[PDB]
Amino acid sequence: RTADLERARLGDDGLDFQDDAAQARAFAQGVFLLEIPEWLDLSAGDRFARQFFQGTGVEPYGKYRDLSSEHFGDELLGYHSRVDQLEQFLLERRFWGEVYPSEIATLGEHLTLLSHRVLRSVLASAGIPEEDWHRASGGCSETNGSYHLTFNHYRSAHQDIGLSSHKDDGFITVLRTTAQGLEVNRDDVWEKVPVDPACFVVNFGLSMEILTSACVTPLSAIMHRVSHQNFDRSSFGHFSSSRCLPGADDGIYRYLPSAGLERVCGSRELIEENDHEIYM
Ligand SMILES: C[C@H]1CCO[C@]2([C@@H](O)[C@@](C)(O)CO)NC(=O)[C@H]1NC2=O
Ligand SMILES: O=C(O)CCC(=O)C(=O)O
Ligand SMILES: [Cl-]
Ligand SMILES: [Fe+2]
């Protein structure tokens, strides 16, 4: 029914779970709760998620409904109506300063540095050598990855599932949710993720699963979905991927213990393949 997730916070040494066993469960499941720093203001992001889809009559964020992928030269970006209840606004970090409201780009930057700290804690626990982190993470072990700040709205009038079962593409997703609907399939049973507006939900994407698939303790990309919503719902997430610019793709790698990194596919290629199976 309801998943019982481990809870972590970022501290002086990195990710702090209650004990080492709890960290191992969290990383093995591929999903856990992360305490939101008390200084971090999420209210503008919350408002953007409630407004982005409403058009230019609605201030200050409704106008982002009018920015489609054409305006960015990148089919992933801008406003997208999906086949499920979900509609989205997606923007990669290279456009945040120019295109997002200033306070929304600020939020994106805070989340990038928090996620960077989360990812480095995970890479260390996997025993991957530090000098391989940059290439293994497509730049996300520093701040050279591809980062999408993505706003979600579930149109409860559409007779669809909220968002189909899927795995995220990348290494780390930091998910901000304040209402029921998110479900996870940790072990062949769907379970509700408990709502705690004081925590983010963190999960691993396909790139984390590929990277660690040959390690002693492989880490999984959690299968998750959003159930059919009878009232409206919104949320947003920060997604870290191997640099996947249209002209500069850092590739997707698997770590072979005692050997090094082996290339599996392209970063954008993984995203296109994954977006395909999610929706059709
Ligand atoms: C890379 C980018 C686009 C790909 O789509 C995802 C995907 O999780 C989803 C469900 O939001 C697309 O609808 N969203 C992102 O922001 C990012 N990662 C995803 O997996
Ligand atoms: O809205 C949610 O809670 C989840 C959204 C999600 O999983 C995604 O956008 O990839
Ligand atoms: Cl609509
Ligand atoms: Fe997701």
| Ligand 1 atom closest to Cα of residue 278 | 10
Distance from the alpha carbon of residue 167 to the mean position of ligand 4, in angstroms:
6
CA distance 210 to 218: 9
User: What is the CA angle 26-153-66, rounded to 5?
Assistant: 130
The three-class DSSP label of residue 91 is strand
Count the Cβ atoms, other than its own, within 10 Å of residue 80.
15
CA distance 110 to 68: 25
Give the residues surrounding ligand 2 with Cβ less than 6 Å away: 150, 152, 163, 168, 175, 177, 182, 224, 226, 235, 237
Residue with token string 């409206």:
232
User: What is the CA angle 198-28-197, rounded to 5?
Assistant: 10
Please, which residues have CB within 8 angstroms of residue 17's CB and are 6 or more apart in sequence?
A: 6, 7, 8, 23, 26, 32
Strand duo 7-11 + 31-35: pairing:
parallel
Amino acid identity for residue 15 in this structure: L
CA distance 245 to 172: 18
For 41, how many CA atoms within 13 A lie in the half-sphere containing its CB? 8
| Ligand 1 atom closest to Cα of residue 148 | 16
Count the Cβ atoms, other than its own, within 10 Å of residue 74.
18
Domain assignments of the chain as residue spans, ordered by start: 7-279
Q: Is 43 exposed, middle or buried (0-12, 13-18, 19+ CB in 10 A)?
A: exposed
| Residue 182, ligand 1, Cβ within 6 A | no
List 225's β-bridge partners, or say none: 183
CB 34 within 8 A of CB 9: yes
Please, which residues have CB within 8 angstroms of residue 112's CB and are 6 or more apart in sequence?
A: 93, 143, 147, 238, 240
Residue (of 157, 139, 126) closest to 255 by Cα position: 126
| Ligand 1 atom closest to Cα of residue 146 | 1
Distance from the alpha carbon of residue 22 to the mean position of ligand 1, in angstroms:
28
Distance from the alpha carbon of residue 259 to the mean position of ligand 4, in angstroms:
32
Strands (E) across 167-251 are located at: 172-177, 182-185, 190-192, 199-204, 223-226, 233-241
CATH architecture for the domain at 7-279? Sandwich (2.60)
Nearest-CA residue for atom 4 of ligand 1: 271
Q: Is 147 left (phi over 0), alpha (psi -120 to 50) or beta?
A: beta
Q: How was this structure determined?
A: X-ray
Eight-state DSSP code of residue 143: T
CA distance 253 to 9: 28
Residue with token string 């530090």:
130
Resolution in A: 2.0
CB 167 within 8 A of CB 223: yes
